[PDB]
Amino acid sequence: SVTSKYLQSTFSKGNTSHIEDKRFIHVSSRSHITPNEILSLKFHVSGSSMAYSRMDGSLTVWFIKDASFDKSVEVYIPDCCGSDKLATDLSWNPTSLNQIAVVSNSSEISLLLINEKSLTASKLRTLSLGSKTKVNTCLYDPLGNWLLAATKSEKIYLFDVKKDHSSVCSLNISDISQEDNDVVYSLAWSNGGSHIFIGFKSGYLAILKAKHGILEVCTKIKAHTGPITEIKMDPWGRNFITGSIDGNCYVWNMKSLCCELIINDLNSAVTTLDVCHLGKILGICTEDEMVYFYDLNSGNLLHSKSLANYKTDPVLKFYPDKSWYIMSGKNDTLSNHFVKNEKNLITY
């Protein structure tokens, strides 16, 4: 019951700060409009940086140095990756401390090294592929050993990041799916780059081996009856969580690959999910503008809330180095959460 009180305190009068971004001051001036979006938001591994990209085209990055974003510098940058094209996915390159990979639904993958002394985001390199190929998702092996780039259909590329991003291998999606017109919806890496977990739209789930740089199909299981939205992994490495649009959220055992626990209070589709860095609490953002916080070990609801028709598409992410979580606010504005006197659950 300690975790329930902790979450309640994290939802209190204080212990909360508004992330002061461009959209925040925009709403402050125009309220005291059509909300663009938040395409994606992804931390650095060491828990001391953050990056995200709205629909306008501008990607913000913060260098966390304070709790309530007091002394946190902010490198705002205009619509990068072209003037017409906007960013859709980014990976933070766990190898170094500054590099970033960004994709813009085009045939060009941009590698930019963000600098903190100035506000200059200088394009370091651009990678290109076949002219028709339209990739939109990039990923980094959590050890910084492989890079993955995926299309909505009929292309999957793996580069070796060590040897100057030499194109290592590729694969046609129709060889992985073997169904009628499947479109990969979400990808994820295993803890320590050894396997790639892919969730198609027709419902299937595939596990590809990427040991020595040669992709191969290990297995395919008919997990869900609708498109798979998100795929997350437990940090301890014992189970991986699958959330779908048919209203189900399962947790699969890693050693044996069989369903072990099911979330049953759900009655709506899932838009995203996330699990804390301690592998203890599981946050589900359903489609009825509502968030839930479940317990991983037992599987019973321990906290609920209600978005109340503010920023229809929400986002949730748990810090990789503290028990804090960034959650969307009212009008596409981010809202930090903390307790200001508890860095981790154990200290509580």
Binding site: V45, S46, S48, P94, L97, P142, S190, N191, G192, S194, H195, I207, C218, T219, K222, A223, T225, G226, P235, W236, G237, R238, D246, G247, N248, Y250, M254, K255, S256, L257, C258, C259, E260, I262, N264, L266, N267, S268, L278, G279, K280, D288, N297, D321, L345, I346
Partner: protein, 556 residues
């Protein structure tokens, strides 16, 4: 009491004292146990068959001995003797008094624990996950110190407790203390041993196997891999027959007990897919008729599911579909062949529930599909009159059922209604009115082939000209055959197999003649003959639309 019982359970397997000398002398006498058992049996059977109304807003406005038997004495001794890996005393006890399993659930869970440990090493040898075992590792703690990255491993410590199942509570891992409880047991070496020991452990756990879904998945995957291993060999039918018998006797009754857990049924059906469909229908029908009744926990579960299905069916609306659809999909996917029949009747004689159900078929897996086709054939073959009581008018359910079937063929494309088409091709021989009706609604709804009864001369003229004028004419006459090319091709593909095309055309033709030679009032004779004529014409328009080139001359 816990520690003392554990010490006695330890002593009671190294031979310090014999078991029955302890069993016969602990507090709850066998007679009081049997009395409590009869009370639980009667209360359960009543609350199952009759049921109880859960008060929601009822009357909310106007204008200890049970705990004793459960928590200590003989039952607690049995649970602990099971935890500590001494299976033979409890097997010998439950061989005599099976009803004891009703007292508490934990016996089934613990028996499943020992069986799952028994079977795990056989399971890994097949469906090979050992090559994939090397991916269960944790993320290293990364930190930036002095402006450089540094990786470290996470540190945990190990505690010993009395609870049997391992866990990891946020910093430390707990384990069962008596770490050599599995000394007396030897895992399986070959599937034959799995049969030989199923006949002992699973015949005891009974219909309660469903309390542990993971065992269903493991056994079903073992079956799938065992059948796949010898796809080439000549003896495949032997293994298929043997696994048929096994799934009939041990697994399917269990999966009939589940609670809103689709994936387990998905696995069991992924194994079932290898049988002849005759056998699947045998198992489904036997489960429906003889094993729902005459077995208590199955009966309880079926009655609960049925009452819940009717409760949901009373609350389907155009406004509440967003969540009721998900709930109905889960409930139908988990336990179909006893929760579908109320739905089939409700759409058999109500108007809009048909459209609602055809909307919600988008969500359930192949098991619900096969069972749905089963109950459709069931209703289509149930003994009842076809014509209305008044005169020669056809009854008022044929039409709604045919509309339902056409909606199925139109919307959900993984349905596999082949057997229904064999029903059509077969029962047309005797002139069954349901066949003709299903064919008419199939052609007119899926294909889109509107008739030519009322056509103004200009439309009639445009209807045979160059392609674009003809297309405009058809879209004016409210005909949508062009936009439905893919599903029309799929349905004609269903028809193509078993070569039903020529048989069906000849049947329709030679049936209208026999309809001409009947005796009735002319006011119905003329209409019937003309209706059959128009149906045949429309069918041939569909055939010429979908089969072109050489396929036509091949199958016409």
């Amino acid at each position: 009491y816990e520690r003392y019982m554990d010490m006695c359970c330890i002593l009671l397997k190294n031979g310090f004292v014999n078991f029955y000398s302890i069993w016969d002398n602990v507090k709850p006498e066998m007679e009081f146990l049997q009395e409590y058992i009869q009370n639980l049996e009667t209360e359960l059977e009543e609350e199952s068959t009759k049921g109880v109304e859960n008060p929601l807003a009822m009357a909310a406005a106007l204008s200890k001995t049970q705990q004793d038997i459960l928590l200590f004495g003989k039952i607690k001794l049995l649970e602990r003797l099971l935890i500590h890996g001494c299976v033979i005393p409890v097997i010998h006890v439950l061989k005599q008094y099976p009803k004891v399993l009703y007292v508490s659930e934990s016996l089934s869970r613990y028996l499943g624990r020992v069986f799952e440990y028994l079977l795990n090493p056989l399971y890994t040898s097949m469906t090979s996950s050992g090559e994939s075992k090397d991916m269960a590792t944790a993320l290293m703690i990364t930190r930036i110190d002095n402006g450089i990255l540094a990786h470290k491993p996470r540190l945990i410590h190990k505690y010993k407790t009395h609870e049997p199942f391992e866990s990891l509570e946020l910093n430390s891992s707990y384990v069962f203390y008596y770490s050599e409880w599995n000394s007396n047991l030897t895992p399986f070496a070959s599937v034959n041993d799995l049969f030989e020991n199923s006949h002992i452990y699973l015949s005891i756990i009974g219909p309660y196997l469903g309390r542990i879904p993971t065992l269903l998945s493991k056994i079903s995957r073992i079956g799938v891999a065992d059948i796949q291993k010898n796809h080439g060999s000549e003896s495949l039918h032997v293994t298929i027959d043997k696994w048929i018998d096994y799934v009939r006797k041990f697994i399917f009754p269990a999966t009939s007990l589940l609670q809103n857990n689709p994936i387990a049924t998905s696995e069991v059906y992924e194994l079932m897919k290898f049988f002849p469909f005759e056998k699947r229908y045998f198992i489904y029908n036997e489960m429906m008729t003889k094993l729902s009744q005459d077995i208590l926990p199955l009966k309880v579960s079926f009655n609960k599911a049925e009452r819940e299905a009717k409760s949901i069916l009373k609350a389907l609306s155009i406004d509440t579909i967003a969540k009721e659809s998900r709930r109905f999909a889960k409930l139908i996917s988990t336990n179909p062949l006893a929760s579908l029949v109320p739905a089939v009747k409700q759409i058999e004689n109500y108007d809009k529930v048909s459209e609602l159900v055809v909307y919600t078929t988008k969500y359930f897996n192949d098991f619900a599909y096969d069972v749905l086709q089963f109950v459709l054939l069931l209703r289509l073959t149930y003994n009842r009159p076809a014509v209305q009581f008044d005169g020669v008018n056809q009854a008022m359910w044929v039409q709604r059922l045919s509309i339902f079937i056409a909606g199925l063929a139109k919307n959900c494309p993984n349905m596999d209604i082949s057997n229904i088409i064999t029903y059509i091709l077969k029962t047309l021989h005797n002139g069954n009115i349901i066949a003709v009706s299903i064919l008419k609604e199939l052609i007119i709804t899926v294909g889109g082939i509107r008739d030519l009864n009322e056509v103004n001369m200009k439309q009639l003229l445009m209807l045979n000209s160059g392609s674009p004028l003809k297309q405009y004419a058809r879209h004016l006459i409210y005909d949508f055959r062009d936009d439905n090319s893919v599903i029309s091709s799929r349905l004609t593909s269903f028809f193509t197999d078993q070569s039903a095309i020529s048989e069906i055309i000849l049947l329709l033709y030679t049936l209208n003649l026999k309809a001409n030679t009947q005796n009735s009032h002319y006011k119905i004779l003329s209409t019937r003959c003309d209706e059959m004529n128009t149906l045949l014409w429309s069918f041939i328009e569909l055939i010429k639309h979908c089969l072109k080139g050489k396929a036509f001359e091949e199958n016409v």
